[PDB]
């Protein structure tokens, strides 16, 4: 979704969209916000604080494009309470070194999460929220997306390469993919086999 909305709004106002995605907890809180050396008192930025600053300091034309700083992962009050006063109404990240970086108008901070089991009213309140229910994406829209990638995207990284240069100037692999797209296409259609098969599977028990 944001990928589609991000690449589409870039083609309406004619401005470059740019997503900076990260896993807020695939790394430690200190690696994310930065820390203070316990001898020289030097402040070193986190991955988030750095990317924000990169924008603020328009050294590489950040000012000529809209940014989206994305956290793709789990949310808890601990790793967020350092982001509150930047999401309330003061748009101001205030680090321990006291430097406090400003949130430009050309920036947006999002989250892509599965659950909120550990988020508090205090951590949700100051955030807009869109809910994507599994029911949106139909099993069918998935089969269809599948059959189209198989018949349009070659398994061979060498073929896509041998297909792209050609465009800028159907390997045998893909031709076989296309032909199969056609042989199996029918078991995917509505009330079909795959469908009937999937429905059954899900109503059975699995180790995980």
């Amino acid at each position: 979704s944001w990928e589609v909305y991000l690449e589409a709004i870039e083609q309406v106002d004619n401005i470059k969209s740019e997503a900076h995605v990260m896993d807020p907890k695939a790394i430690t809180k200190d690696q994310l916000f930065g820390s203070l050396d316990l001898t020289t008192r030097e402040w070193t930025d986190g991955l988030f604080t750095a990317t924000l600053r990169r924008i603020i300091d328009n050294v590489r034309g950040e000012s000529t494009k809209r940014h989206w700083i994305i956290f793709d992962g789990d949310v808890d009050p601990e790793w967020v309470e350092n982001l509150n006063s930047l999401l309330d109404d003061n748009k101001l990240l205030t680090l321990p070194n006291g430097e406090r970086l400003a949130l430009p108008n050309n920036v947006r901070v999002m989250f892509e999460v599965q659950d909120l089991k550990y988020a508090t009213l205090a951590t949700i309140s100051r955030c807009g929220m869109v809910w994507f229910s599994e029911e949106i994406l139909t099993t069918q829209m998935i089969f269809q997306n599948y059959l189209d990638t198989l018949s349009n995207e070659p398994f061979d990284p060498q073929e896509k390469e041998q297909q792209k240069r050609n465009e800028n100037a159907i390997p045998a692999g893909l031709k076989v993919q296309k032909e199969c797209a056609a042989i199996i296409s029918q078991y995917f259609e509505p009330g079909g086999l795959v469908h009937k098969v999937l429905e059954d599977a899900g109503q059975r028990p699995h180790i995980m």
Binding site: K25, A26, I27, D45, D74, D76, Q114, K117, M208
Partner: protein, 96 residues
């Protein structure tokens, strides 16, 4: 290895070979106070997003020929954590 594009990628030092990282009790990693198995959100990241962030110089690293395999006991056993759904999405399962 900094690529022509200007991007840096992590790859096996061994010429012409995919490193296979076999993780034996993948479901054992303890969660934090907030139900998160970090090694697992980390591994999802590599598998789903293509890489990870080097926290020393803030550069995104794109794996080249690296893959993971996992094995473990069913979550019903003691000590086993039920793997997040964001992960199992990329993890095909074979019961033995």
């Amino acid at each position: 290895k900094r690529t022509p594009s200007g991007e840096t990628v992590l790859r096996p030092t061994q010429l012409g070979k995919w490193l296979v990282v076999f993780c034996d009790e993948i479901n054992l990693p303890s969660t934090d106070k907030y139900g998160t198995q970090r090694v697992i959100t980390f591994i999802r990241q590599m598998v789903e997003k293509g890489g990870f962030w080097r926290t020393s110089d803030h550069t995104w690293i794109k794996l080249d020929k690296i893959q993971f395999v996992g094995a473990c006991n069913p979550p019903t056993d003691a000590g086993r954590v039920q793997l997040t759904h964001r992960f199992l999405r990329h993890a095909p399962i074979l019961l033995v």
